[PDB]
Amino acid sequence: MKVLCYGVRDVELPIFEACNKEFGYDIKCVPDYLNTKETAEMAAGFDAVILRGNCFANKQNLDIYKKLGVKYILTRTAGTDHIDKEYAKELGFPMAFVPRYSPNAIAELAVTQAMMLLRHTAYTTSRTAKKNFKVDAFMFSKEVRNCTVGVVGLGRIGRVAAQIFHGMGATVIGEDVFEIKGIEDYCTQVSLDEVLEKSDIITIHAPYIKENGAVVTRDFLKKMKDGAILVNCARGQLVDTEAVIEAVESGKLGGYGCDVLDGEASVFGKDLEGQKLENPLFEKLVDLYPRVLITPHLGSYTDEAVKNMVEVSYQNLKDLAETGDCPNKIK
């Protein structure tokens, strides 16, 4: 079984190899993502591809895969919007994804951003890096053990974020569209309005539902505590970026941390130092550092998460090859 793996970072190579010990696949890893015709043509000779984010399995590239006789299309991700699933089905491609991997990978990043803001360590160290060791009023901080933390979205990631903040001593509350059972030892489930009213820190872990639109709107922000912290390591489209910028400029938000942005593909992964950013919202967000912190979608960039993503993907391929089916088959 010959498997082409796209978007393979050199740091990921040992994981692809180690996880392959129990599978024996004939793997090839390339750094290229799936975009141009020529990236799709790289799959000549291969039985399966393992895509990741930003690997566009669109009509053009799926037609090329069919012509080339690719049998299985996998993505090592929880997200599948980069694949045109309806067209893939029309062409008969069996596909699989990775709905579940390290929730702590994302949750710890959310927590670390939140603390960098709550305890003003990004602000402080941005200053000391420049030999400014002065102490100012903005630097004065709360303790997270004396805070209420609000989790918006109590899925797998959200629950782990709540557990972690609870373990640091916070009082945690949270909101979800459904009744979330078994969280009572670490989180009280309440209304969104109660989360907004009471939270010193808010972290977003809800799914993006296109018909709902952004969850973090002007009206969401308006109900928050002045000086509260907001963190979005979920999805860019959950927040109205402009509205957040305005809440940071007004002081409604003490700080904003994000690992994702609405339109992030224009900047993430690129070194644009010295350039005017094409999206003026992104230019503003960068200018607001260190009261806005941006990480380029690293929430799943841990050793455990990547191991999980690669190992589930290998298992998914084996399931598909042996049975035509898999627990994570894209529906």
What report would you give on this structure?
With 331 residues, this protein is of the alpha/beta class. The protein is 35% helix and 15% strand. The PDB classes it as oxidoreductase. Keywords: structural variant of the bab Rossmann fold, oxidoreductase.
Summed up, what is this model?
Helices cover 35% and strands 15% of the residues. The protein is of the alpha/beta class.
Question: Which features does this protein show?
Answer:
seven-stranded parallel beta sheet, Rossmann fold, alpha/beta
Topology:
Elements: E1 2-5, H1 13-19, E2 26-29, H2 37-41, E3 48-51, H3 59-68, E4 72-75, H4 85-90, E5 95-96, H5 103-118, H6 121-128, E6 148-152, H7 156-167, E7 171-175, E8 188-189, H8 192-198, E9 201-204, H9 218-222, E10 228-232, H10 241-250, E11 253-258, H11 280-287, E12 292-294, H12 303-323
Parallel strand pairs: 1-2, 1-3, 3-4, 4-5, 6-7, 6-9, 7-8, 9-10, 10-11, 11-12
Q: How are the strands ordered across the major sheet? A: 8-7-6-9-10-11-12
H and E order:
EHEHEHEHEHHEHEEHEHEHEHEH
Per CATH, the architecture of the largest domain is 3-Layer(aba) Sandwich
What proportion of the residues is helical, as a percent range? 25-40%
Q: CATH superfamily assignment of the largest domain?
A: NAD(P)-binding Rossmann-like Domain
Kindly provide the radius of gyration, computed on alpha-carbon positions and rounded to a whole number of angstroms: 22 Å
Distance between the termini: 24 Å
Q: State the total count of DSSP E strands.
A: 12
Main sheet overview: 7 strands, parallel
Strand portion: 5-15%
**Would you give the CATH topology of the largest domain?**
Rossmann fold
Text of the CATH class of the largest domain: Alpha Beta
Query: What overall geometry do the principal axes of the alpha carbons give?
Result: globular
With helices defined by DSSP (H or I, 4 residues minimum), what is the helix count? 12
Label the structural class: alpha/beta
PDB class: oxidoreductase
Keywords: structural variant of the bab Rossmann fold, oxidoreductase
Assembly: monomeric
Entry title: NAD+-dependent (R)-2-Hydroxyglutarate Dehydrogenase from Acidaminococcus fermentans
